[PDB]
């Protein structure tokens, strides 16, 4: 039945400034579309409906209009605290949500805070090895990791974990962790975590060496 | 005000069946009609259906016709969604909501987690990460929390009162085994001199486990 088309998908803005995402039915709904904020770890909040009625509570930045098939909705004077994903829905017959859209907001680009930590005594009698990097509260979010073992780039046991955009500092964060046997670990003795982001053409280098203890 | 009541996490094994359900206070679903929502984790909001509890009568979108099946208990002022021969598709947060057109889903659930899979449950190893000898006024320490079974688990430290200075990384998937890893700030000159704990809680499995940072041995 009805579909509801949803742009952008994804939205970037910065702080003080205002987004519009469009809606589009594929029959007039009469304007019966309403709007919701998600965030993870959230259940969804009703923000406007009937195309344009601000529930009462929401800040009235928050704003919506249009009619037929084609609808809009506007966030103004953006905050940190409005990263969510937000979505459409018709409720003219039965009920059906838009795709979404995940708003970014952007501040000043920021460079990572990195940390590396060998393999715990506790791990390493399990016979496996991770060693874990930290990447934390950098901006934007496009960042390339690479691990050296004895100087040497290895690409083959490596997991990266990005956060979510963190709600007060605009910030992201990631983990990178190379993970051996612990046979390959005790094999070399250097390993190094290099964090390369547009903030620096330099490489934010950080090592250590493997001793016997 | 209106309170909407979910039924705890569900893991359960693929071709199965599994019932949720939903709670209401507040009002009498009597009154209104109840709707489901589904959300898979990294995806968008469906709708599901719904039921008018005066009547028992039910709508469905027709993707889930079969596969969903809702009722209501008009004297439990409650409604249920029974989800038939599940799959890795149907894994996901499953939402309750009040109906009315005015306003539109404004009271929710808090969501319902239905995991699909064969994986046996498992609770976490937890290692403590601590610094190479290398390591201004900051120090970084951290925690690996590796191969548990279903998500999610909840990682804090010092039981919540270091808060500011704590990332915590989505997990990663791997031979049926999750491994996700947390990190905390804090100044150097309270570690080690005071203790910092990594805490992990693993609901599926019900345990809680504690990890001291201590320092590496190295230096004696």
């Known amino acids: 039945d009805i579909q509801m088309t949803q742009s952008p998908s994804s939205l970037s803005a910065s702080l003080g400034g205002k987004v519009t995402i469009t809606c589009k039915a594929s029959q007039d709904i009469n304007k019966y579309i309403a709007w919701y904020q998600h965030k993870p770890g959230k259940g969804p909040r009703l923000l406007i409906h009937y195309t344009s009625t601000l529930h009462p509570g929401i800040p009235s930045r928050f704003s919506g209009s249009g009619s037929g098939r084609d609808y809009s909705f506007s966030i103004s004077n953006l905050e940190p605290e409005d990263i969510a994903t937000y979505y459409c829905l018709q409720y003219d017959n039965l009920r059906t949500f838009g795709g979404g859209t995940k708003l970014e907001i952007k501040r000043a680009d920021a460079a990572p805070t990195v940390s590396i930590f060998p393999p715990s005594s506790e791990q390493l009698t399990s016979g496996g090895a991770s060693v874990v990097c930290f990447l934390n509260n950098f901006y934007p979010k496009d960042i390339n990791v690479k691990w050296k073992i004895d100087g040497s780039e290895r690409q083959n046991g490596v997991l990266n974990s990005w956060t979510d955009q963190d709600s007060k500092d605009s910030t992201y964060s990631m983990s990178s962790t190379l993970t051996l046997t612990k046979d390959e670990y005790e094999r070399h003795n250097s390993y190094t975590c290099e964090a390369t982001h547009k903030t620096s053409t330099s490489p934010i280098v950080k090592s250590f060496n493997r001793n016997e203890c | 005000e209106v309170q909407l009541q979910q039924s705890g996490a569900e893991l359960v094994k693929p071709g199965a069946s599994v019932k949720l359900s939903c709670t209401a206070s507040?009002?009498?679903?009597?009154?209104?009609?109840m709707h489901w929502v589904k959300q898979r984790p990294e995806q968008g909001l469906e709708w599901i259906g719904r039921?008018?509890?005066?009547?028992?009568?039910?709508k469905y979108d027709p993707k889930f016709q079969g596969k969903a099946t809702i009722t209501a208990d008009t004297s439990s002022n409650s409604a249920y969604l029974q989800l038939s021969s599940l799959t890795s598709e149907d894994t996901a947060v499953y939402y309750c909501?009040?109906?009315?057109?005015?306003?539109?889903?404004?009271?929710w659930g808090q969501g319902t987690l239905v995991t699909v899979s064969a994986a046996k449950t498992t609770p976490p190893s937890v290692y403590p990460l601590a610094p190479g000898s290398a390591a201004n006024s900051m120090v970084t320490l951290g925690c690996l929390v590796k191969g548990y079974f279903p998500e999610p688990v909840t990682v804090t430290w010092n039981s919540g009162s270091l808060s500011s200075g704590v990332h915590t990384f989505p997990a990663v998937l791997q031979s049926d085994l999750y491994t996700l890893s947390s990190s905390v700030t804090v100044p150097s000159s309270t570690w080690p001199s005071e203790t910092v704990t990594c805490n992990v809680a693993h609901p599926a499995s019900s345990t809680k486990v504690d990890k001291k940072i201590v320092p590496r041995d190295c230096g004696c």
């Open positions: 507040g009002f009498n679903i009597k009154d209104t009609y």
């Open positions: 039921i008018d509890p005066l009547n028992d009568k039910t």
């Open positions: 909501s009040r109906g009315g057109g005015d306003p539109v889903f404004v009271y």
